[PDB]
């Protein structure tokens, strides 16, 4: 029979007032014989009605994928409201319910520290600029790098690691040509998190 999967909004979308956060109820294994699916939505037990169904998609394995999308307010998500999707279909002895929400717990402000390359890396063609982000809760975050207003895309970021005090830490490493580091260019670590002032902080780093 049909199965249900319910996904949160992207961190960025909940954090940027100019973006639109949405939760997504995905129903897989929908039969050709009974493709009609009914969605009910609840925000903290109270039903809402502004969900919209995305176009039906036929899958290579003879089933349909049906997806309902509920737009949410930023602050409802950040305040920790609970979102329930209830799915009904004829080929289903009983309706399936699924609930998701922000991680429970007091939010803690990330501490953001930029770290130049080791004197030992200076021999190499390319150098590592490190952004250490520690002491944040929950683990929902965005880390990006830039220089002179332009995104620097040659970075990688570790997944959040759970620390011994109950918060999370990660590190983000941007690899630049040594010559650009020598050239006095300023690089910036952009961190977005609910518990930061205005959801945003930026830390800069240049040849000392």
């Amino acid at each position: 029979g049909p199965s249900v999967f319910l996904f949160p909004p992207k961190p960025k979308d909940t954090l940027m007032i100019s973006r639109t956060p949405e939760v997504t109820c995905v129903v897989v294994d929908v039969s050709h014989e009974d493709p009609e699916v009914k969605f009910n939505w609840y925000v903290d037990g109270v039903e809402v009605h502004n969900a919209k169904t995305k176009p039906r998609e036929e899958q290579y394995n003879s089933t349909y994928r049906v997806v309902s999308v509920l737009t949410v307010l930023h602050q409802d998500w950040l305040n920790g409201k609970e979102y329930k999707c209830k799915v009904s279909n004829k080929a289903l002895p009983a309706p399936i319910e699924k609930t998701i929400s922000k991680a429970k717990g007091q939010p803690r402000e990330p501490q953001v520290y930029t770290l130049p390359p080791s004197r030992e890396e200076m021999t190499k063609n390319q150098v590592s600029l490190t952004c250490l982000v520690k002491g944040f809760y929950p683990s929902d975050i965005a880390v990006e790098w830039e220089s002179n207003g332009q995104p620097e895309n040659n970075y990688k970021t570790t997944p959040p690691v759970l620390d011994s005090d109950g918060s999370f830490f990660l590190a983000s490493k941007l690899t630049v040509d040594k010559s650009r580091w020598q050239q006095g260019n300023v690089f910036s670590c952009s961190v977005m998190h609910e518990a930061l002032h205005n959801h945003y902080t930026q830390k800069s780093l240049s040849l000392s």
């Binding site: 954090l15 990006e144 977005m192 002032h197 205005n198």
Partner: peptide
Amino acid sequence: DCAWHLGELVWCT
């Protein structure tokens, strides 16, 4: 005061 990110508005208190 307001925070911006690559031109796009982040948040204002």
